[PDB]
Design an enzyme around this catalytic site. Structure first.
Site, short mmCIF file in Angstrom:
data_model
loop_
_atom_site.label_atom_id
_atom_site.label_comp_id
_atom_site.label_asym_id
_atom_site.label_seq_id
_atom_site.Cartn_x
_atom_site.Cartn_y
_atom_site.Cartn_z
N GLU A 103 0.35 -0.65 -0.20
CA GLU A 103 0.30 0.01 0.08
C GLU A 103 0.78 1.77 0.19
OE1 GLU A 103 -3.41 -0.66 3.26
OE2 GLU A 103 -4.51 -0.94 0.97
N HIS A 116 0.66 -5.17 8.14
CA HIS A 116 0.06 -3.97 9.19
C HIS A 116 -0.11 -4.91 10.18
CE1 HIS A 116 -1.22 -1.68 5.34
NE2 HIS A 116 -0.17 -1.72 6.19
N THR A 195 -6.69 1.85 5.41
CA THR A 195 -6.70 1.66 4.96
C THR A 195 -7.65 0.82 4.03
OG1 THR A 195 -5.29 -0.16 4.42
CG2 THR A 195 -4.35 2.61 3.97
N1 LIG Z 1 -5.48 -1.78 6.66
S1 LIG Z 1 -5.19 -0.84 8.19
O1 LIG Z 1 -5.23 0.45 7.56
O2 LIG Z 1 -3.60 -1.36 9.20
C1 LIG Z 1 -6.67 -1.11 8.88
C2 LIG Z 1 -6.47 -1.12 10.20
C3 LIG Z 1 -7.54 -1.73 10.91
C4 LIG Z 1 -8.42 -1.25 10.87
N2 LIG Z 1 -10.13 -1.74 11.26
C5 LIG Z 1 -10.30 -2.38 12.28
O3 LIG Z 1 -8.86 -3.10 12.84
N3 LIG Z 1 -11.05 -2.51 13.33
C6 LIG Z 1 -11.86 -3.46 14.82
C7 LIG Z 1 -12.16 -3.42 15.73
C8 LIG Z 1 -12.49 -4.28 16.13
C9 LIG Z 1 -11.76 -5.24 17.01
C10 LIG Z 1 -11.04 -5.34 15.87
N4 LIG Z 1 -10.31 -7.37 15.90
O4 LIG Z 1 -11.15 -8.23 16.32
O5 LIG Z 1 -9.04 -6.92 14.79
C11 LIG Z 1 -10.58 -4.60 14.88
C12 LIG Z 1 -8.94 -1.11 9.40
C13 LIG Z 1 -7.86 -0.45 8.27
ZN LIG Z 2 -3.53 -3.11 7.01
#
Ligand SMILES: NS(=O)(=O)c1ccc(NC(=O)Nc2cccc([N+](=O)[O-])c2)cc1
Ligand SMILES: [Zn+2]
Length: 257
Positions: A103, A116, A195
């Site tokens: 990305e 990530h 992202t």
């Molecule tokens: N691709 S990223 O920019 O690294 C990204 C990171 C995190 C999210 N969103 C989440 O992780 N939400 C979330 C919220 C609660 C619990 C969990 N989970 O169990 O991993 C995940 C979206 C994109």
């Molecule tokens: Zn990611």
């Protein structure tokens, strides 16, 4: 819903998530000659010794390894960060070909994949609160290039057969994420967003200079995963990356010279 195809991919996301066109979107191109060294950046503190992994999951957009974040067990601090950020999950973005799969880009160069490691700021109590805050998340980004195998990745590769399709998960306890890190913790940093939808502008990005090497066989097994669920027309999970977004009114800082 949203995905990475011609009809639901990143060019479509702004219709459901208008922040797609916002002032601090990720990923971005890292122009190494324009990033400024900042001597006031502290070293990163990656404390993963007590990390407690739980499950590995195909969520239809990537695969994810989740961790116990109900205590300060695996935390990120230092660098540009204030306070303590708990590791919640890691996932990857990868390409159909080795010349694309990241990305972020570095001087417009695309890597075969990007890791990530997603952390949230404990002052906000839970992830859901943190994603509503401009300093709620810190994501550690690590580029993957194709070369020699990464031993610390092989246990992940080993299990992807059992989560081929959207919705499958498996036990994935006792995994040590320290085996995914490169030697150097030199990094670039900038304020950005998730992202994937909802693309919330809640992320301090910390992108490591040094890529890790993975073998062609390891990344090949990423490319065997499916976006679809079981019993559906097979669409290989490849090219699940958002392209670089406008830097706009942002400075990328470097922790190194
Ligand atoms: N691709 S990223 O920019 O690294 C990204 C990171 C995190 C999210 N969103 C989440 O992780 N939400 C979330 C919220 C609660 C619990 C969990 N989970 O169990 O991993 C995940 C979206 C994109
Ligand atoms: Zn990611």
């Amino acid at each position: 819903h949203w995905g990475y195809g011609k009809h639901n991919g990143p060019e479509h996301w702004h219709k459901d998530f208008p922040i797609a066109k916002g002032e601090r979107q990720s990923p971005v191109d890292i122009d190494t000659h324009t990033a400024k060294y900042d001597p006031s950046l502290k070293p990163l503190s990656v404390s993963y010794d007590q990390a407690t992994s739980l499950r590995i999951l195909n969520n239809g957009h990537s695969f994810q390894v989740t961790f116990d974040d109900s205590q300060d067990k695996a935390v990120l601090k230092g660098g540009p960060l204030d306070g303590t950020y708990r590791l919640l999950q890691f996932h990857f973005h990868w390409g159909s070909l080795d010349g694309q799969g990241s990305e972020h880009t570095v001087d417009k160069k695309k890597y075969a994949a990007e890791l990530h490691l997603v952390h949230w700021n404990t002052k906000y109590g839970d992830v859901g609160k943190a994603v509503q805050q401009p300093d709620g998340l810190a994501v550690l980004g690590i580029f993957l290039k194709v070369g020699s195998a990464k031993p610390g990745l092989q246990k992940v590769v080993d299990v992807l057969d059992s989560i081929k399709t959207e919705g499958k998960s498996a036990d994935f306890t006792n995994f040590d994420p320290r085996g995914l890190l490169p030697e150097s913790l030199d990094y670039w940093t900038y304020p950005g967003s998730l992202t994937t939808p909802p693309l919330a502008e809640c992320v301090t990005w910390i992108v490591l200079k040094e890529p890790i090497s993975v073998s062609s066989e390891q990344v090949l097994k990423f490319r065997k995963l499916n976006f679809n669920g079981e019993g559906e027309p097979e669409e290989l999970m490849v090219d699940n990356w958002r392209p670089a977004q406008p830097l706009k009114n942002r400075q990328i800082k470097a922790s190194f010279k």
